[PDB]
Amino acid sequence: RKQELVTQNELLKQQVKIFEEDFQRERSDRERMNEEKEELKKQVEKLQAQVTLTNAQLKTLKEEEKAK
Amino acid sequence: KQELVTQNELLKQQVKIFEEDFQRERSDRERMNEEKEELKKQVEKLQAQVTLTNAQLKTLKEEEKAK
Amino acid sequence: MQIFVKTLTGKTITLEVEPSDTIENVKAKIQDKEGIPPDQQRLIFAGKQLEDGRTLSDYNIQKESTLHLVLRLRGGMQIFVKTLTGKTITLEVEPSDTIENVKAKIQDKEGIPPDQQRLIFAGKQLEDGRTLSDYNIQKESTLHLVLR
Amino acid sequence: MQIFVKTLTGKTITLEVEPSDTIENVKAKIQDKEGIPPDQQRLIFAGKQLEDGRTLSDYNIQKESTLHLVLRLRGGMQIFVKTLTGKTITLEVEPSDTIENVKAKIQDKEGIPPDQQRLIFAGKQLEDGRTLSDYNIQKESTLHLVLRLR
Numbered sequence A: 001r002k003q004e005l006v007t008q009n010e011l012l013k014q015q016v017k018i019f020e021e022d023f024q025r026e027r028s029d030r031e032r033m034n035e036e037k038e039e040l041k042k043q044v045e046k047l048q049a050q051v052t053l054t055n056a057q058l059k060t061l062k063e064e065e066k067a068k
Numbered sequence B: 001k002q003e004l005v006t007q008n009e010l011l012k013q014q015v016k017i018f019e020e021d022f023q024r025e026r027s028d029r030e031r032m033n034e035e036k037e038e039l040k041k042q043v044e045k046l047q048a049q050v051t052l053t054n055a056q057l058k059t060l061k062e063e064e065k066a067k
Numbered sequence C: 001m002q003i004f005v006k007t008l009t010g011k012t013i014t015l016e017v018e019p020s021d022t023i024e025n026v027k028a029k030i031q032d033k034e035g036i037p038p039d040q041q042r043l044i045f046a047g048k049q050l051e052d053g054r055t056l057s058d059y060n061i062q063k064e065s066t067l068h069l070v071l072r073l074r075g076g077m078q079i080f081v082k083t084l085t086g087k088t089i090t091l092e093v094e095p096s097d098t099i100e101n102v103k104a105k106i107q108d109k110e111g112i113p114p115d116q117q118r119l120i121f122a123g124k125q126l127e128d129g130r131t132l133s134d135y136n137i138q139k140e141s142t143l144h145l146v147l148r
Numbered sequence D: 001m002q003i004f005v006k007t008l009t010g011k012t013i014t015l016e017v018e019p020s021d022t023i024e025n026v027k028a029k030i031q032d033k034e035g036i037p038p039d040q041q042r043l044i045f046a047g048k049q050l051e052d053g054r055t056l057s058d059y060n061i062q063k064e065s066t067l068h069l070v071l072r073l074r075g076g077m078q079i080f081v082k083t084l085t086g087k088t089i090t091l092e093v094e095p096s097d098t099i100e101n102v103k104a105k106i107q108d109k110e111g112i113p114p115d116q117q118r119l120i121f122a123g124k125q126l127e128d129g130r131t132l133s134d135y136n137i138q139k140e141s142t143l144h145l146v147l148r149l150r
Helices: A002-066 B002-066 C023-034 C099-110 D023-033 D099-110
Strands: C002-006 C012-016 C041-045 C066-071 C077-083 C088-093 C117-121 C142-147 D002-007 D012-016 D041-045 D066-071 D077-083 D088-093 D117-121 D142-147
Touching: A002 B002, A002 C077, A002 C088, A002 D041, A002 D066, B002 C041, B002 C066, B002 D077, B002 D088, C012 C023, C023 C041, C088 C099, C099 C117, D002 D023, D012 D023, D023 D041, D077 D099, D088 D099, D099 D117
Parallel strands: C002 C066, C077 C142, D002 D066, D077 D142
Antiparallel strands: C002 C012, C041 C066, C077 C088, C117 C142, D002 D012, D041 D066, D077 D088, D117 D142
């Protein structure tokens, strides 16, 4: 019984350690994914600025023409 | 032995807690992937708008030259 | 009523409670003494998990009883903090955390003194006496850490 | 020879083995029977963490011995599978898993039969016999699942 309970003690401790390691790896992957999300947000910002600029250039080009 | 009995029951609880914690972390990472995928769609739409507007600029300049 | 709370480490503390106190109040008391958020706490008695809404009387807990505290690996709310070097750290926070509380958590993880930390969110540097909720900083928001 | 494998969950399965089966072979039997990849399996006997390259004979494991299976919640590589309805499925895979294996994992997780599944990656529909590495499918890649309903 004490050998049986020490056996379960050992197996339970090992299961806890594995689960804690699994969690830390999942957390690390989630951090990386945030970083990738943040770089996508910068790309969106950059592209929105390009579209805004080109739209303004298009309008301007048409007014430069009418000014002829 | 009773001290050992208590530690095994606490350890059992810790196993169940830690699995719950992992499953929440996994669920959060999945939702983050969905958020990434939505941003990738926005990037795609925006890239499409850039190629269109760039192309319109170039052809306006060419149309004006041709007159 | 006076109760012990003990972890799987050697850690043990004493709490001033009443038999009418709910488990959620006991968790709030543990936060006050020990700095452990309630959402990171699981309290155990006779091998079973105590529900937040129940009283101590509901589990037949008497004075000089020992409750067992098992800490979670996370709570409900995380935020991300990005450094200039592209490193990310994630912090376990509550919306009631002050900016100084957040800086102390960063010191805990990375060793950087709070007075040398500047936290930025939505282009604004964050003031020490204000909370996360004051800036509408949500779950999974990203703050930027810049060093003085 | 028939041994037993016991999870901490209380689940006992019974396996048909031969002495000097590598622990690797026993883990494969467990994956055929239960949903569990070998990299999420850790087998223990007589307090010894059992190594994949050594054998049942190696560990003095007699005819109807019981092994203890400790489980991981994840392995080394995950991919995401997005459904047409917006739901995400995370799968525990290996780069040499076939598309057939991936569809079987989706079945085990979600209950959708494999011949009903069409998997898409990078605007290309994925062929059953090929592997994830064949398509340049990396960890944290997102596949799209579309159902073929007749």
